[PDB]
């Protein structure tokens, strides 16, 4: 699983010591973020469980 | 100006923000997503 | 080069379908892009008319929805550009058309760049 | 769906800006095309800012909410062609054309 983004993080005091950060700008250029898995292993492990059923 | 399933997901934003002085206020550049924000009807 | 050589009919009865085709010679239409038509009217600009990709997603002109229909013939690398019984108003030169793009990111989720199309036809000065 | 004006004279050494309208404009790129005279019309503008290789950097490009900008800073006089803007449908469908533009130097 990935977050493919290169990003940067701004900070600003808004209390006296109150200082949050927060999601200011992105490197690169937007992508989505994911997840993979071995589709042949998840039947194969999938058809365990029905039989299992 | 983007075709991905990444359309109109990240939002650029603007702010009023309370400084660290009590009558200092400051407009404020952020990003933020789509399941953090509601349209109360740039909205 | 990836050349795109025009062919169809000629001098065209009114109110006919035309399915024309377009031999891509360096014909390796594997997926890589889409391909598509559009047309000029012989005093007058442009006219995008479809878009095909490999696969076999088709795009079309709403103004152009119904008397039109695209196809591939990717065993001979060839293209379709079938019509319905369109009149004498269409006179216009055809050109077959390709837009290249750029893969960007994730290609199953449209992640990528429409680079500009990339490289024309020939003319194809049809008569009706 | 798109609107363009159709012929914009100048005399040589000027800087000419053509533009194009659409509501999608806000949403879609604009790409930029030059049908030299019995030519396959050559991409000059894609993504609304870049141009390819092989363009000189004469050719520059904006846009501005429902209006996009062809710039073309010192314009020579071999450089009259007509200039198409193509862009897409708002649901990102279809394509569609500019109208037409003329250009005439001197």
């Known amino acids: 699983c990935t977050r493919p983004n290169n990003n940067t993080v701004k900070s600003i005091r808004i209390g006296p010591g109150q200082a949050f950060y927060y999601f200011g700008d992105v490197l690169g250029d937007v992508r989505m973020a994911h997840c993979n898995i071995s589709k042949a292993t998840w039947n194969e492990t999938l058809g365990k469980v029905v039989k299992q059923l | 100006k983007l075709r991905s399933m990444m359309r109109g997901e990240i939002k650029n934003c603007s702010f009023n923000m309370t400084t660290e002085l009590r009558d200092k206020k400051q407009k404020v550049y952020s990003l933020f997503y789509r399941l953090d924000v509601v349209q109360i009807n740039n909205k | 080069q990836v050349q795109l050589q025009e062919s169809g009919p000629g001098l065209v009865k009114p109110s006919g379908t035309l399915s024309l085709t377009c031999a891509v010679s360096?014909?390796?239409?594997?997926?890589?892009?889409?391909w598509s038509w559009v047309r000029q009217p012989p005093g007058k600009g442009l006219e995008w008319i479809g878009e095909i990709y490999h696969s076999g997603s088709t795009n079309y002109n709403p103004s152009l929805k119904s008397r039109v229909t695209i196809s591939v013939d990717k065993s001979k690398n060839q293209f379709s550009l079938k019509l319905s019984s369109v009149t004498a108003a269409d006179t216009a030169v055809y050109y077959c058309?390709?837009?290249?793009?750029?893969?960007?990111?994730?290609?199953?989720?449209?992640?990528?760049?429409?680079?500009?199309?990339?490289?024309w036809g020939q003319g194809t000065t049809v008569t009706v | 769906e798109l609107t363009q004006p159709p012929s914009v004279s100048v005399s040589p050494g000027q800087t000419a800006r053509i533009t194009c309208s659409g509501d999608?404009?806000?949403?879609?790129?604009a790409y930029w095309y030059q049908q030299k005279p019995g030519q396959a019309p050559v991409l000059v503008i894609y993504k609304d800012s870049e141009r390819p290789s092989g363009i000189p950097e004469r050719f520059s490009g904006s846009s501005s909410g429902t209006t996009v900008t062809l710039t073309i800073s010192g314009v020579q006089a071999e450089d009259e062609a007509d200039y198409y803007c193509?862009?897409?449908?708002?649901?990102?469908?279809?394509?569609?054309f500019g109208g037409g533009t003329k250009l005439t130097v001197l």
């Open positions: 058309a390709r837009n290249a793009i750029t893969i960007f990111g994730v290609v199953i989720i449209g992640e990528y760049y429409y680079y500009g199309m990339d490289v």
């Open positions: 999608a404009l806000p949403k879609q790129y």
């Open positions: 360096g014909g390796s239409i594997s997926s890589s892009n889409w």
């Open positions: 193509q862009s897409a449908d708002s649901s990102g469908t279809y394509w569609v």
